[PDB]
Amino acid sequence: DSLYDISCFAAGLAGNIFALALFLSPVTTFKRILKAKSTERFDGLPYLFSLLNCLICLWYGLPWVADGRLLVATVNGIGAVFQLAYICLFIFYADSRKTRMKIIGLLVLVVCGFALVSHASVFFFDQPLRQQFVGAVSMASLISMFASPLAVMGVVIRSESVEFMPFYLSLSTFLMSASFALYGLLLRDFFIYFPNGLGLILGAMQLALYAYYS
Amino acid sequence: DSLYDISCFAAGLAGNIFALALFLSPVTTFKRILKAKSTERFDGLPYLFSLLNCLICLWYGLPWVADGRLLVATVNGIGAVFQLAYICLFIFYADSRKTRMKIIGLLVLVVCGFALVSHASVFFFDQPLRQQFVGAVSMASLISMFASPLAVMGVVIRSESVEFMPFYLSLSTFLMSASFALYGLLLRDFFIYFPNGLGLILGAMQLALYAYYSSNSLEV
Amino acid sequence: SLYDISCFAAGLAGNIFALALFLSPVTTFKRILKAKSTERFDGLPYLFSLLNCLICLWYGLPWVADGRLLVATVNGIGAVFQLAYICLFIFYADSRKTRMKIIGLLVLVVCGFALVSHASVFFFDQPLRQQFVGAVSMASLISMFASPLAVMGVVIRSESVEFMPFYLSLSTFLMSASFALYGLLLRDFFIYFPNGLGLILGAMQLALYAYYSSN
Ligand SMILES: CCCCCCCCCO[C@@H]1O[C@H](CO)[C@@H](O)[C@H](O)[C@H]1O
């Protein structure tokens, strides 16, 4: 009765915290940027990607696009802020006109691209199609993000070292995916569960792979 | 059929008029191939890609696939002819057996691919799904086209030159996108509007850079 | 009556021709067998082929889609091969890392498949379930066409037919021609379109070989 509603609240809230560590992770890399006050070692795009991904999922969270999936709006809303901050700092601490011009442009594309689809979903669609369209787009967007953790695992093995795959980040993320998969499961929302379920698996292999290497 | 009915025609036509410049654009690049009679310098794939895009959108244009959206059929039908001509000139002038043959297989592939999907849809589907299916396929095709303008935008930034991004082409495409995005908006057609909307943003994005690099050029 | 048996014929033809495609990597594998090492080889396709065979297997089962039993049979056969091929690949390998990169991917495939296989039955009810799985399988199937196409490109560059056997392509082509036919009668887009897409490639494969055989 009252319990189920608190439980949905619990699963989402668990994720919103666990997500924070992941959001936090660029800062350690970012300090190295703050060092030498140059961006030479890394570009620099993923933040642009993460922001776009957060924006679309944020849209999904809003009550008109999907209802009772509001906790999801909060986490990406937090995340969109995180990615937005990283980029703004990235722009300031940039090496050359060329990086600065490139990142600014992509930010324009991301903001405009998101604006166009976010408007289009509400303008051109009436529920229940609007949810599945945003839900489909948001989900596809999320799975694409799995490319980076998959890549990091690939790096870890060949290198034979876990230096770049921190245990703290990997665990919090596994659990984050886990909370959300349950949350998706409770509303019987395919769009929340399936991508988050896939992330969990990736998180699971990451921990297991980590342990052997330790 | 009323007042708004004139407007849609206008937008479709306007888009239809702006589209040719994009269609014509390879010819200036193309003219060099013909002299010295070789393609060694240029491959050569995009014309094949553009054609496949034009057929699918063309098919969407047709009345059985979609109703009241023939202008789309016209613009792509026009484009497909340009692309087919571009391909054929490219075929004869292809340098080496491998270039000429590879294109033939791809060209064989494109027409076969299109015939199969165009048949499958009319055969396997009853409206409104057919419209939705083709529009979905048509739209996905159109966004892929966007890969090329994004890259040239990338080169301009690296080059710090507007040499490869002519203003005439940028404006024309921007207008084609605006016209077609507007056209889609009027009919409440997501399939036409959205990529064109996406294309408009790219077009706008291109105009902004040219203004910056042309203004910040050495000559000024 | 007459047609029902006809369904069995087209599916059977495909189920038989599949073994030839499934068998074809064995010849490259024998080379793996001598010296028990994979230095030349990184075998992503066996991991790729298994996952595709798995998903279509799901589409084949009666609760997922009904009367789609032959497709269930053929990939179920196929998945084991890929399952078998992966196993020989793991024990005989160059370094722990070649083995280890692959081990994880196999975990992903089984977990990935289980997750999607379960998710479908849990979150979806007919007629959507058939539509969802058929789509995932279909998209998966069309992706497989990438390898034969590249080989076509190779034939052109090489000016040689060494990298694609003539016997292999027709057997593949006949399966593609037969299975596309299997899909059409039940009016199943999901079976027909990709398989129809495959035969076309198959036709291209045969024609190129014929060209090179002549001159
Ligand atoms: C020789 C290079 C072989 C692939 C390189 C491995 C690391 C690349 C990250 O993986 C990516 O995962 C995504 C979904 O998980 C996919 O969008 C994408 O297709 C895939 O590339």
For every residue of C98-123, DSSP letters joined together read: HHHHHHHHHHHHHHHHHHHHHHHHHH
Going by the DSSP 8-state scheme, the letter that residue B219 receives in this structure is: T
| C-alpha span between B189 and B71 (Å, rounded) | 13
**Which residues from chain B sit within 8 angstroms of residue C187, using beta carbons?**
124
Q: How buried is residue A86: exposed, middle or buried, by Cβ count under 10 Å (0-12/13-18/19+)? A: buried
Q: Is A157 in the pocket of ligand 1 (CB under 6 A)?
A: no
Pick from B55, B65, B191, B70: which is nearest to B128 by CA?
B65
Domain boundaries, chain A: 1-214
**How many Å lie between the centroid of ligand 1 and the Cα of residue C47?**
14
| C-alpha span between B100 and B84 (Å, rounded) | 15
Whether residue A89 contacts residue A102, with contact meaning beta carbons closer than 8 Å, is answered with no
Pick from A82, A45, A66: which is nearest to A129 by CA?
A66
Q: Which amino acid is at C138?
A: M
Q: Which amino acid is at A42?
A: F
| C-alpha span between B136 and C139 (Å, rounded) | 14
Cβ distance B102 to C153 less than 8 Å, yes or no, reads yes
| C-alpha span between B44 and A19 (Å, rounded) | 46
Whether residue B219 contacts residue B40, with contact meaning beta carbons closer than 8 Å, is answered with no
Whether residue C196 contacts residue B120, with contact meaning beta carbons closer than 8 Å, is answered with yes
Whether residue A83 contacts residue A24, with contact meaning beta carbons closer than 8 Å, is answered with no
CB burial string C169-202: b at 16+ within 10 A, e below: bbbbbbbbbbbbbbbbeeebbbbbbbbbbbbbbb
Provide the CA B156 distance to its chain's centre, in angstroms: 21
The count of other CB atoms within 10 Å of the CB of residue A52 is 21
**Which residues from chain C sit within 8 angstroms of residue B113, using beta carbons?**
197, 200
Backbone angles phi, psi at B64, to 5 degrees: -65, -40
**How many Å lie between the centroid of ligand 1 and the Cα of residue A147?**
6
For A123, the token pair is: 């303008």
Coil, helix or strand for B93? coil
Whether residue A205 contacts residue C101, with contact meaning beta carbons closer than 8 Å, is answered with no
Q: What separation, in Å, do the N-terminal and C-terminal C-alpha atoms of chain A show?
A: 44
Helices C69-91 and C25-33 cross at an angle (nearest 10°) of 20
| C-alpha span between C10 and B42 (Å, rounded) | 45
Q: Which numbered atom of ligand 1 lies nearest the CA of A148?
A: 9
For A50, the token pair is: 């993460």
Alpha carbons within 13 A on the beta-carbon side of A27: 9
| C-alpha span between A120 and A122 (Å, rounded) | 6
Q: Is A150 in the pocket of ligand 1 (CB under 6 A)?
A: yes
Which residues, in sequence order, are CB contacts of C52 under 8 Å at separation 6+? C75, C137, C140, C141, C143, C144
Helix (H) or strand (E) holding A165: none
Which regions of chain C does DSSP assign to beta strands (E)? none
